[PDB]
């Protein structure tokens, strides 16, 4: 992701992609007795175990130490999931997309105390990306930034270390910027059309992490620290090779 | 804001700043009687009326009307306070100016239950616009942007009018754009340079946000209601013309 081209970085990332995931509950039994919540953190939970084996994937991601892999995801995992259901659901107006055997609107989320205000805001971004006619290229870069971006100013302290693994960090950053903008250049828009692409999906990123902090107030809203089962995930041997 | 040049519009805006304003306390008498909250309370709540004046100077926001005036200054008066702030303090390593006569380090920040956080995010932001060397002209559009930004996809509903306010809304963000990547093409740097700066500046507000966003979690975490204080403030009559 520095002496890899555009074209390398988006053919990684396309690579990358985690699978698509259905919710578990017997299709044959009524809906009143599904737990929605339940049913969305099931859900929720396996996407996760997907997630950190695509963040490795991630050109840039592994160079950095252990525990700043586990502060960038526990600062972003959120985001993630909520931009990879925006994604999935832009196709599908007025409806949220969270497994292909389930496809929610509004009035489904009124169901959880709170819940429907989240529905609106992922239907809303959903909305955008199509207006926005927002491709898999750019959105494959999006999620990388989010995973780099969410976390790189909560590196608290700065070692030696530290201040390498920003340095290599805003690099990475900077490469993917570089492969946005080629993205759109190849696609034929202007100079000008081109930043100011740029910027229109930039600032999505702002209403991803709005949504991700009003979703960890509702999920909070009410066993193992998160750190520690993201670690215990990402800190794998090589046995299995 | 679409047959006004950039120069144009980056004049309007380090014309419309807010003036910078002292905190209120008796400098006679000892600190530890002062209590902080109260002196940050009293501040932000001064700063407010500034800003709502200096709103209606930025370009494209009066043609608003007065309903998605008040929405997006209720969703963004804490980020704009809080770039303000970072903005203020650059040149000032390691401490927050809220104040003229208060500049304040994080273990001042200690004094007020669970505050530090938040200061240390503060301090984080202005150690990187620091590091960025941040110029006056690009943080006047940076917080134009956040206006205009922050509350456009909480315009819920979409009346022939509020499509419109829209429409109207992503033209002026577009012309910010092309005026911040000529404020950088004027200062030379490359076209390269200029898109991933681009990047590095919009990607520091989804920083922003996230601070805003933990800082309402804080002031909640605890007369009539933000947006009617904020409607009495815009609907302005034109008497004392
Ligand atoms: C939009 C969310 C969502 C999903 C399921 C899949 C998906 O891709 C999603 F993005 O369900 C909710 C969901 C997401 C995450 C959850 O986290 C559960 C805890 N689990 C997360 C990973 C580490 C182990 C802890 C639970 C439900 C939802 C949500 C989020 C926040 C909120 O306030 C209301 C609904
Ligand atoms: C960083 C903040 C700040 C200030 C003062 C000026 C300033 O420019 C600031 F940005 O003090 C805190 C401050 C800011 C806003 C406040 O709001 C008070 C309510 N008032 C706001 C405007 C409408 C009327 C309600 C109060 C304190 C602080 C803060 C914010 C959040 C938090 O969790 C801890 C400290």
Do not use: C
């Given at each position: 992701?520095?002496?890899?081209?555009?074209?390398?970085?988006?053919?990684?990332?396309?690579?990358?992609?985690?699978?698509?995931?259905?919710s578990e509950y017997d299709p044959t039994r009524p809906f009143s007795e599904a737990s929605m919540?339940?049913?969305?953190?099931?859900?929720?939970?396996?996407?996760?175990?997907?997630?950190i084996n695509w963040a490795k994937r991630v050109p840039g991601f592994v160079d950095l130490t252990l525990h700043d892999q586990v502060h960038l995801l526990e600062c972003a995992w959120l985001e993630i999931l909520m931009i990879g259901l925006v994604?999935?659901?832009?196709?599908?107006?007025?409806?949220?997309?969270?497994?292909?055997?389930?496809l929610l609107d509004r009035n489904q989320g009124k169901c959880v105390e709170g819940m429907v205000e989240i529905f609106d805001m992922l239907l809303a971004t959903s909305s955008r990306f199509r207006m926005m006619n927002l491709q898999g290229e750019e959105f494959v870069c999006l999620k990388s930034i989010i995973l780099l971006n969410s976390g790189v100013y909560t590196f608290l302290s700065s070692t030696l270390k530290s201040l390498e693994e920003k340095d290599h960090i805003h690099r990475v950053l900077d490469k993917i910027t570089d492969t946005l903008i080629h993205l759109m250049?190849?696609?034929?828009?202007?100079?000008?059309?081109?930043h100011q692409r740029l910027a229109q999906l930039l600032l999505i990123l702002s209403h991803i992490r709005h949504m991700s902090n009003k979703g960890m107030e509702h999920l909070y809203s009410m066993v193992?620290?998160?750190?520690?089962?993201?670690?215990?995930?990402?800190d794998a041997h090589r046995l299995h090779a």
């Open positions: 992701a520095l002496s890899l081209t555009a074209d390398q970085m988006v053919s990684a990332l396309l690579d990358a992609e985690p699978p698509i995931l259905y919540m339940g049913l969305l953190t099931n859900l929720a939970d396996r996407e996760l175990v997907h997630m994604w999935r659901s832009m196709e599908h107006p007025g409806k949220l997309l969270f497994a292909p055997n389930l250049a190849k696609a034929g828009l202007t100079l000008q059309q081109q193992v620290p998160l750190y520690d089962l993201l670690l215990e995930m990402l």
